[PDB]
Nucleic acid binder design. Structure first.
Lengths: 129, 99, 378, 334, 225
RNA sequence: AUGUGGAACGGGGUAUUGUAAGCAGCUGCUGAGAUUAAGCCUUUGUUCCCAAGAUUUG
RNA sequence: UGGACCCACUAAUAGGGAACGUGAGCUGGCCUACUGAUGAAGUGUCGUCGCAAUGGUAAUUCAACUUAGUACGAGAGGAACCGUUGAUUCAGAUCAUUGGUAUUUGCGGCUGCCUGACAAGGCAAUGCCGCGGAGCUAUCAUCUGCUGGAUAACGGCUGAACGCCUCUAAGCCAGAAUCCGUGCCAGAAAGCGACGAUU
RNA sequence: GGAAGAAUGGGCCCACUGUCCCUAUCUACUAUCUAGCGAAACCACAGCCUGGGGGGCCAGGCAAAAUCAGCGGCUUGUGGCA
């Protein structure tokens, strides 16, 4: 499972894809497993599965409401050890509902929270920081 | 383990400060908010008077080992002796710097 | 989905309509408000009937769309022509109900008084009830069809299979029961296995579906299944004639059934002893026959330790169980002193990481440093 | 809106927390106390190993915010008797001690110095004259009464507070027969009861106090009682080795550098509480043993602190003690 | 070859690391996996239950051999001290501070020959060669930088991605001086390293691995006998 | 309403800014200077203040 | 529930009423309530410590690991009780850690004017900029959110009516997020008690 | 985060922003008190709620002064005809 962690990627936001599948920019549509809260747009963060559309990339891949896992976040969130973490940008991965990415590599460091939650993401990761 | 600040070059205790990682797999720890903003603005520590880097370079200043009871006991006393000896040299150095 | 009775379905539909839609309309309101209230109740009644009919149609499959083996078995064991007729009658009834509801809604759109609406509301319900009551035998046939379909197995002709057919009680079922974990009951009465029994089996890292067939409606079903199936024939002939059928009769039956056995591997099993002799009484040769039928159907050296050449869960469960058992890392340590292993260590003292600045050589270095410090002081 | 139960949102009528619910008595159990009242000074954060079975964070390192509450030992000054009646608990009589601490006398007087200090004067003499009368009253307590509470007061002198009035309150004495409680109360007259008597460095306590005031419905200054809130450590500041975590050694004192914000320097017995507590700093708080009996793993697990932070809470402090500070900083002109 | 799953996932390689002389297991998870490892090779080789950097991805992040074991520099010093206490004295553990944090996923090492990602630093390669006492070659597996995760290495055989060319597979096998088989495990999963772990005498695969894949792995690793 | 009393100041500790003015010869003074409780901690520091006025009370 | 009959989450996105729902909350084609704040008064007097009549109430739900790839199922698949950890909504607090906050007009930097000059200062309706403690606040930060009885459906037991039988008639047992208490808050300003002094 | 309700604005796109998520903080004034000055509308009599015939009637519930501040007022699930 995953503990409470700061949400900072609400719907109607543009978020960058960091794999080799050819996708470049990702548009958030909806968030999996969100409660029925009143007047609160669901958000996303590292290790969270959300519904997103590929804005730019390969034409066949885009125009599909597909699950996406965020791997990088600008917002500063606290890790349970007590240290606050923030990244230079927001990065995500192109993944099927089963939990498998079409791409075969990732770019740059990878949050361990995303890596530990999804074991095959750690398999594709080469730099876990 | 208390890490060393990237900008302030001081002791960083757990909890306080922030951790910043880079695309080149380089992670920088900022001791305080001012230090984090100092690294945010790319202020040179050698160009910052209140930084140990300038204080040093301006004339102003992996294999684990099996534990042993005797080694641990002597390590603590040696550290206290090392600090006492090191502090005296700085006082002489400051006196020489003042003179 | 389960098939309810005609009376029960009407009551459930009527009860659901009353429970969901409001039932308190005072006569002092507007005519449109009364018209809207009556129309909503009618529309809800139409929707509930439409949902039930659509669910029945979706649950009911298409005989043509089914596989050739499944469709033939369905037609033989369920009278697919009669089933198709009943489904069309239900579909026609659903269309007729929708037309009646649309006519009633249009009539309700020009409603005048509460009594006119009340009479119209009753009239629509009565017409629907009569249509539902008329379509009574269709529900009974559907319920019987659902029970037969549920009891029916999932045929997989694409995968490797072994069809056992021949004289009844010729030991083919016993061989099938031995080969596969599926156990079909056998009785002294002939044609005990009314329906085919399929048992999955593993051989040479391959999955084989041992499917039994009725001895020779059951015979017709067995013939139809063997007609369209990628499987090998397992014609078992009673060598000792203990199955009640003569050897010549079994041979004649096998020759007659050879048109269905064509384009497949044929095995001649000499029961109660490819021609394979299998002693049904002695239960000998069953494995050999199955194997034959399956075959017919088809510088970095390793430092292996001496211990390798020659539990934790139980321990945790006994003490406190999972989630209540804490495993101590001190025990799983190679420290020389057991007291040292079970004791803590100094992590960081006086602002310095002592654990990161303590080395085994410091034991002698400290004494040397102490001597050096004294010499420097002197 | 908020909870309907907490209505009305009126300011508390009591400055200090009142324990309305007390643990059920058990004569089989030995005589023991149930409630404590200390002073909230401030808070810090500590580093602690998280030995939670079955959790994903099992046998590893976690950071938890803690609160520091100074609890100087009280002085038992009297006992009261309570009788179970068809109208509830009724106060039968009350017996006190001889030499009341001078802070207690401040409680009875709104203008102590102007008053002639006449409180309990005739009671003191009548005790020294004839202890038989007191013995008769204690006979009444031990014979007729069913619930016994001892009169205890905070001893504020050794605290670093401008206030000089002792906070008086009652603590149930649960355990043993009625005569056993009275005898325990009698033998504890005029003496001090330490915090270590009731809490054992790992126990299930309920912190009570009046929340802080945000000003104007009313917003702030209501009575509150928090549940759970496990204890992390019951320090003994009288020992110079009070904080002194075994893992880190690093000789230190609980008092943060420069003193607690708006409180001062903590010197006496203090209790460490996880999370937060109702009420702002330098306010009297009340603790009590948890009413219910729950053996949940979050309430039964042992705690062995790894490292506590004694940095400068005033501003963005970064130094634990001057001993570790001086050698890091270059030798200044002073 | 033994088929088992960690928690509810068969990706044993991510959650555990198996060497020719020691075994790495996670902490705080399902105790059945530790019992299975202990029953399989616990009495033969040590099995350490610890987390590197407070994570259960130690198998997919740490790389090592029977001679030496390498861990990311981000691992806690307290974790390192516990590892040395658990591990035998002849086992060498060295911290690696390189641009690649996932040592296991980037480089797969055998008892004699090791293949690392081309982006590995020269100092890290020298440290790896010094620690593991094996030859380190900087190359790519199936055109993927993550050679240590998309391919599996063992003394008696090697497993590569099914998309690898025959000539490339032959070249890699000749370079590794061991037989190589290109395929997929865990019912078609292309992460052979993440989905399979094989030692010199024992092999541990996912519980969901296909029987044909298990039979192929046993023949390739010669683990049948 | 005479006290480990109160107060105003000041010292120390703690903190923010960034190394002053000036003396000078970027460097030294100087990781200085300034501010530091007005809702920070402490006071063997100097000073004065007070064993006070009115009102209602069986 | 979030977005223009729809398309996704979620456990679901139930139906209504307040007869011109709430158009004197909303838009388009004096006095009396309620909330809070004081308050004179019996009880001699003032004060401390309690009692608690009564009134209100608060937590909901998900997934996650064992218990499992066991029961079961030819297989394909695949339980549950318990135990334990997380998450969502809501509630009650708290400002160590992080962020926000600038009338500390605190420190630093920038521009202009003046004294014949340097210095020296001052000002620019808070000139401009950086940092900025303490405070305030953050589902942007953290902590915590029970346990006993009586019940409905329902399962039964004994047992007549009715020489059998019968959960019922006389009785009893079990059993629902239900009901009533426990805890939580208010504390009668015309409910009360113990206790200290009493010109 | 960036239209989910300041930028310089530029060429549906891009940029921008508390429109919104979700409000938080500050300053000033008003508000507030004190001193002084000081109205008018309006006024049968007044003023606690449930039910029955509204605030005055009947039967109930209750009921403690003086005040300050924010602020309300029959119908349902079953067609008809022969």
């Amino acid at each position: 499972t995953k503990y409470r962690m700061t949400l900072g990627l609400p719907v109607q936001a543009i978020m960058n894809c960091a794999d080799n599948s050819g996708a470049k920019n990702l548009y958030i549509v909806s968030v999996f497993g969100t409660g029925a809260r009143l007047n609160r747009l669901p958000a996303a963060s590292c290790g969270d599965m959300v519904l997103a559309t590929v804005k730019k990339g390969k034409p066949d891949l885009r125009k599909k409401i597909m699950p996406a896992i965020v791997v990088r976040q600008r917002k500063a969130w606290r890790r349970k050890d007590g240290v606050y973490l923030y990244f230079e940008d927001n990065a995500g991965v192109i993944v099927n509902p089963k939990g498998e990415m079409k791409g075969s590599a990732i770019t740059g460091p990878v949050a361990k929270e995303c890596a530990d939650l999804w074991p095959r993401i750690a398999s594709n990761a080469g730099t876990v920081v | 383990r208390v890490h060393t600040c990237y900008f302030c070059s001081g002791p960083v205790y757990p909890g306080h400060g922030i951790m910043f990682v880079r695309n080149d797999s380089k992670v920088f720890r900022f001791c305080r908010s001012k230090c984090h903003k100092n690294f945010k603005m790319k202020r040179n520590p050698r160009k910052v008077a209140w930084t140990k880097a300038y204080r040093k370079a301006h004339g102003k200043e992996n294999v684990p080992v099996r534990y042993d009871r005797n080694v641990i006991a002597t390590t603590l006393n040696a550290m206290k002796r090392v600090s006492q000896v090191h502090a005296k040299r700085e006082r002489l150095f400051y006196k020489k710097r003042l003179a | 989905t389960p098939i309810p009775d005609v009376n029960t379905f009407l009551d459930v539909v009527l009860s659901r309509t009353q429970r969901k839609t409001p039932t308190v309309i005072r006569s002092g309101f507007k005519i449109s408000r009364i018209r809207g209230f009556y129309g909503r109740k009618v529309k809800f009644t139409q929707d509930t009937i439409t949902e039930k009919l659509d669910s029945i149609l979706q649950e009911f499959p298409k005989l043509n769309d089914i596989h050739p083996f499944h469709a033939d078995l369905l037609n033989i064991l369920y009278d697919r022509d009669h089933l198709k007729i009943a489904l069309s009658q239900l579909s026609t009834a659903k269309h007729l109900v929708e037309n009646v509801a649309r006519d009633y809604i249009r009539l309700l759109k020009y409603g005048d008084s509460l009594y006119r609406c009340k009479q119209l509301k009753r009239a629509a319900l009565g017409r629907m009830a009569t249509i539902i009551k008329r379509q009574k035998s269709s529900l009974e046939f559907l319920e019987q069809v659902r029970q037969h379909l549920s009891r029916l197995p999932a045929i997989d002709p694409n995968t490797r299979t072994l069809l056992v057919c021949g004289y009844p009680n010729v030991g083919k079922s016993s061989f099938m029961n031995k080969v596969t974990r599926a156990q079909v009951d056998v009785q002294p009465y002939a044609f005990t296995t009314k329906s085919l029994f399929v048992g999955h089996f593993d051989y040479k890292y391959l999955r084989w579906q041992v499917i039994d067939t009725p001895g020779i409606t059951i015979e017709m079903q067995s013939i139809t299944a063997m007609a369209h199936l990628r499987s090998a024939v397992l014609y078992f002939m009673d060598l000792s004639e203990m199955c009640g059928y003569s050897v010549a009769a079994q041979v004649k039956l096998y020759h007659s059934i050879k048109p269905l056995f064509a384009n497949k591997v044929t095995i001649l099993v000499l029961n109660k002893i490819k021609v394979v002799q299998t002693s049904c009484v002695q239960d000998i040769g069953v494995m050999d026959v199955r194997t034959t039928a399956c075959e017919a159907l088809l510088a970095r050296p390793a430092c292996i330790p001496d211990s390798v050449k020659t539990l934790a869960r139980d321990i945790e469960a006994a003490n406190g169980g999972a989630g209540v058992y804490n495993v101590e890392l001190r025990d799983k340590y190679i420290l020389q002193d057991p007291s040292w292993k079970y004791d803590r260590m100094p992590e960081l003292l006086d602002g310095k990481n002592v654990a990161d600045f303590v080395d085994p050589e410091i034991e002698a270095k400290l004494l040397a440093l102490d001597e050096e410090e004294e010499r420097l002081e002197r | 809106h908020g909870s309907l139960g907490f209505l009305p949102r009126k300011r508390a009528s009591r400055q200090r927390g009142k324990v309305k619910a007390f643990p059920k008595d058990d004569a089989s159990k030995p005589v023991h106390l149930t409630a404590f009242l200390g002073y909230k000074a401030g808070m810090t954060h500590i580093v602690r190993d998280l030995d939670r079975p079955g959790s994903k964070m099992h046998k590893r390192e976690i950071l938890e915010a803690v609160t520091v509450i100074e609890t100087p030992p009280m002085v038992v000054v009297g006992v009261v008797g309570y009788v179970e009646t068809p109208r509830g608990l009724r106060s039968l009589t009350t017996v006190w001690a001889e030499h009341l601490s001078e802070e207690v006398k401040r409680r009875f007087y709104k203008n102590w110095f102007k008053s002639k200090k006449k409180a309990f004067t005739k009671y003191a003499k009548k005790y020294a004259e004839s202890t038989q009368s007191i013995n008769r009253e204690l006979e009444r307590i031990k014979k007729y009464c069913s619930v016994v509470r001892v009169l205890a007061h905070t001893q504020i002198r050794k605290t670093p507070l401008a206030q000089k009035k002792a906070h008086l309150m009652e603590i149930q004495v649960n355990g043993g027969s009625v005569a056993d409680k009275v005898e325990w109360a009698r033998e504890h007259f005029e003496k001090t009861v330490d915090i270590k008597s009731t809490f054992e460095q790992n126990e299930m306590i309920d912190v009570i106090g009046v929340t802080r005031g945000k000003g104007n419905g009313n917003a702030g200054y209501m009575h509150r009682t928090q549940l759970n809130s496990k204890i992390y450590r019951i320090g003994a500041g009288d020992d110079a080795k009070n904080a002194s975590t075994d893992f880190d050694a690093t000789e230190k004192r609980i008092t943060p550098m420069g003193g607690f914000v708006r409180y001062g320097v903590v010197e006496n017995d203090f209790v460490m509480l996880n999370g937060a507590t109702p009420g702002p700093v330098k306010r009297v708080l009340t603790l009590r043993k948890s009413l219910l009996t729950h053996t949940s793993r979050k309430a039964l697990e042992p705690v062995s602190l790894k490292w506590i932070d004694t940095a400068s809470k005033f501003g963005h402090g970064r130094f634990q003690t001057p001993a570790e500070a001086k050698q890091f900083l270059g030798t200044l002109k002073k | 070859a033994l088929r088992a799953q960690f928690e509810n996932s068969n990706e044993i390689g991510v959650f555990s690391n198996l060497t020719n002389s020691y075994a790495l297991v996670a902490l705080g998870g399902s105790e059945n996996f530790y019992s299975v490892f202990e029953a399989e090779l616990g009495d033969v080789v040590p099995v350490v239950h610890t987390t590197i950097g407070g994570t259960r991805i130690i198998g997919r992040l740490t790389c090592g051999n029977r001679k030496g074991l390498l861990v990311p520099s981000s691992t806690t010093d307290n974790e390192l001290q516990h590892l040395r206490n658990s591990l035998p004295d002849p086992v060498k553990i060295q911290r690696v501070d390189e641009r690649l944090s996932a040592l296991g996923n980037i480089v797969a090492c055998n008892d004699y020959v090791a293949l690392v990602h081309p982006d590995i630093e020269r100092e890290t390669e020298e440290i790896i060669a010094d620690v593991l006492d094996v030859e380190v070659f900087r190359q790519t597996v199936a055109g993927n930088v993550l050679t240590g995760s998309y391919c599996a290495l063992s003394n008696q055989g090697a497993l590569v991605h099914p998309r690898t060319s025959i000539q490339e597979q032959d070249e890699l096998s000749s370079l590794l001086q061991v037989p190589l088989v290109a395929g997929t495990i865990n019912r078609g999963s292309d992460v052979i390293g993440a989905g399979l772990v094989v030692n010199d005498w024992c092999a541990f695969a996912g519980l969901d691995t296909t029987a044909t894949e298990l039979a192929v792995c046993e023949s390739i690793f010669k683990l049948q006998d």
